[PDB]
Amino acid sequence: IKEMPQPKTFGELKNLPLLNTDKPVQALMKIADELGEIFKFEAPGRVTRYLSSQRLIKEACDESRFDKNLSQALKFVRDFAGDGLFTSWTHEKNWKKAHNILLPSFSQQAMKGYHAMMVDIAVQLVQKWERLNADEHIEVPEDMTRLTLDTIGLCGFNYRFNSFYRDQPHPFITSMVRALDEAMNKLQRANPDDPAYDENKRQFQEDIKVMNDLVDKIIADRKASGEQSDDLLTHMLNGKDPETGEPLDDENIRYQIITFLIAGHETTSGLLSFALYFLVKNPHVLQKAAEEAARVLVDPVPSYKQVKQLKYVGMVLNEALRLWPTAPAFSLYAKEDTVLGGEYPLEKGDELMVLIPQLHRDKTIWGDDVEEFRPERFENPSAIPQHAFKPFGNGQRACIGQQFALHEATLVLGMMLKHFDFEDHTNYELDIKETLTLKPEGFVVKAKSKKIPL
Ligand code: HEM
Ligand SMILES: O=C(COc1ccc(OC(F)(F)F)cc1)N[C@@H](Cc1ccccc1)C(=O)O
């Protein structure tokens, strides 16, 4: 039995002021580098333990011992994402019900059906970059967010956000981004009930009402039209849970749609941005990925089967998820008293935080070249120890969107590498902005067309 370390305290506020920063995940990463594989973190009325080693995380990923917990971030997101899949407890009736209904909508098979819609948006991104003048550059996370938001709108509910037609966001997205900003900002507040936060609280309540009103109208409009478009909203209106025999109610469908819009906006766009960042910093890797793109994508429009053959591009995306898992943490609670790694006794209900970027830097797993970008690490999943690589979370509470995200990211990165050469014209210095998720901020490149027709 070992006594785990704890970072510096601030009297009655304990560790809470360590989160008073615009980059709290990167701050926690630095604490993990100093303190090691486990540390205690305390706030008024809160204790958790930050895990960084595959040795301890492999135990945390035992579903017989640990279930998904809502971190404070997810509790604050629940104020608008409700009992949607991402912000529900495993024991809430709507979790397993929505999980059973939606799993077929998110399978590798279902991706054949979403592929044409994904290609519609990917082609819009390629045509935008083709049409840039020689003196112009690309705002990478901006354009990746335009793509991923538009893809989930079209596959979610046959709705065009038309992000490539715009500078200014859709009213739903103004409210969604501001609600995510209030949720993630409220985490750090030493004195949340201070009157200085009354405008923040008023504006939050207004943003929740906006998201609810606009999504409720999308659902109402679809039931009214009777249209049977092959999208998630149709699957949720028609689907029955095989267990209960019940469909989702309109309020839960709204929470699922809000949840999918958060994911499309925040996560896949981060992955594509980090992937292109690592490729321009690693020209030998960029060349090898570009060679695969050219050899496989032999038609003007990629097919589903061709995306499945971009294996090296898939490895590039996994190695980007290794160094910068854009959804960087998940939380677990002990189902019963249990001992972690033979050294740390936990009681029933005790909380754990998995710090995914630190897990992914465990040198006992990846070796001394752990900071290097090497997609070849992923050639043989059987050579990777259990629970070493967790960018989609764990077990039954893992990302339902994983096949969707990787299909879209593989398609688009393959088209980008086929159609353009890239230049890191500014020698960009990685600056990671934290919203719900991690993204390169200010990452810009130049793209020179290979002049290959669509
Ligand atoms: C690279 C892209 C993505 C990454 C890295 C990612 C990552 C994650 C992670 C780590 C979790 C587990 C969270 C936890 O345990 O608290 C999760 C859950 C989830 N993700 Fe994603 N995600 C991605 C894309 C998407 C997309 C595109 C969708 C839907 C359009 C989506 C929907 C969800 C849902 C609904 C859950 C909750 C699943 C459940 O518990 O039933 N994600 N995601
Ligand atoms: O450690 C984190 C990291 O923040 C994120 C958690 C989940 C998250 O979701 C996702 F990974 F899905 F993006 C994003 C960021 N959050 C903790 C921070 C905290 C706050 C107060 C007391 C103690 C600890 C949490 O939200 O509980």
Residue linked to tokens 């699957």: 235
Q: Give residue 335 CA to ligand 2 midpoint distance, Å.
A: 20
Cβ neighbours, 10 Å, residue 170: 17
Three-state DSSP at 39 gives: strand
Q: Which helix (H) or strand (E) holds 423?
A: strand 420-423
Whole-angstrom distance between the N-terminal and C-terminal Cα of the chain? 63
Pocket perturbation via mutation, ligand 2, pick of 187, 259, 432 by most ligand atoms within 8 A of CB: 187
The whole-angstrom separation of Cα 155 and Cα 92 is 27
Regarding the beta carbon of 85 and ligand 1, being less than 6 Å apart is answered yes
Q: Residues 259-287, buried b or exposed e (16+ Cβ, 10 A)?
A: bbbbbbbbbbbbbbbbbbbbbbebeebbe
395's tokens: 């077990």
CA-to-CA distance for 394 and 38, rounded, in angstroms?
Answer: 19
Structure determination method: X-ray
CA–CA dist 269, 262 (Å, integer) = 11
Distances (CA, A) of 138 to 129, 130, 149, 405, 453: 8, 11, 18, 22, 20
Ligand 1 within 6 A of CB of 264? yes
* Contact partners, residue 21, CB within 8 Å, separation at least 6: 27, 188
Beta bridge partners of 438: 434
Q: Which mutation among 71, 86, 351, 399 tests ligand 1's pocket best, with the greatest number of atoms within 8 A of CB?
A: 399
Contact indicator for 335, 348 with CB cutoff of 8 Å: yes
What's the CA-to-centroid distance between 401 and ligand 1, angstroms? 6
Nearest to 178 by CA among 262, 260, 85: 262
Integer Cα distance of 356 and 57 in angstroms: 9
The active-site residue, picked from 86, 161, 392, 422, is 392
Is 155 annotated as contributing to ligand binding? no
Beta bridge partners of 330: 354
Q: Say whether 80 sits in a helix, a strand or coil.
A: helix
Which residues does 361 contact at the CB level (< 8 Å), separation at least 6?
52, 370, 371
Q: What resolution does the deposited structure have, in angstroms?
A: 1.6
Sign of CA dihedral 69, 72, 73, 74: positive
Distance CA 318, CA 362 (A): 16
What is the spatial distance between Cα 99 and Cα 88, in angstroms, rounded to a whole number?
11
**424: burial class by Cβ within 10 Å (0-12, 13-18, 19+)?**
middle
Alpha carbons 204 and 207: distance in angstroms, whole number = 5
Strands 46-51 and 351-355 turn out to be parallel
Separation between Cα atoms, residue 176 and residue 170, nearest integer Å: 10
From 111, 399, 103, select the one nearest 235 (Cα to Cα): 103
Distance 77 CA to ligand 2 centre (A): 11
Pairing type for strands 344-346 and 338-340 reads antiparallel
Q: Is 86 a catalytic residue?
A: no
Residue nearest to atom 15 of ligand 2 (CA): 436
* CB of 436 shorter than 6 A to ligand 2: yes
Sign of the CA dihedral running 60, 62, 66, 68: positive
**What DSSP element (H or E) covers 344?**
strand 344-346
Residue 448: name the closest of 409, 413, 421 by CA.
Answer: 421
Q: Which H or E run contains 420?
A: strand 420-423
- Total domains in the chain come to 1
Token pair of 337, please?
Answer: 């008293």
User: Looking at ligand 2, which residue's alpha carbon is closest to its atom 7?
Assistant: 329
DSSP-derived secondary structure for 191-228? STTSGGGHHHHHHHHHHHHHHHHHHHHHHHHHHHH---
C-alpha to C-alpha distance for 443 and 432, rounded to whole angstroms: 10
Q: Give the angle subtended at the CA of 371 by the CAs of 405 and 62, to the nearest 5°.
A: 55
- For atom 14 of ligand 2, which residue has the closest CA? 436
109, 110, 114, 115 alpha-carbon torsion, rounded to 10°: -10
Its domain, for residue 243, covers 1-454
Among candidate residues 234, 235, 383, 375, the one with its CA nearest the CA of residue 318: 375
Alpha helix (H) ranges present in 7-48? 24-35
Whether 325 contacts 391, CB under 8 Å: yes
Q: Is 197 annotated as a binding residue?
A: no
Contacting residues for 428 by C-beta, under 8 A, at least 6 apart: 277, 280, 440, 442, 443, 444, 445
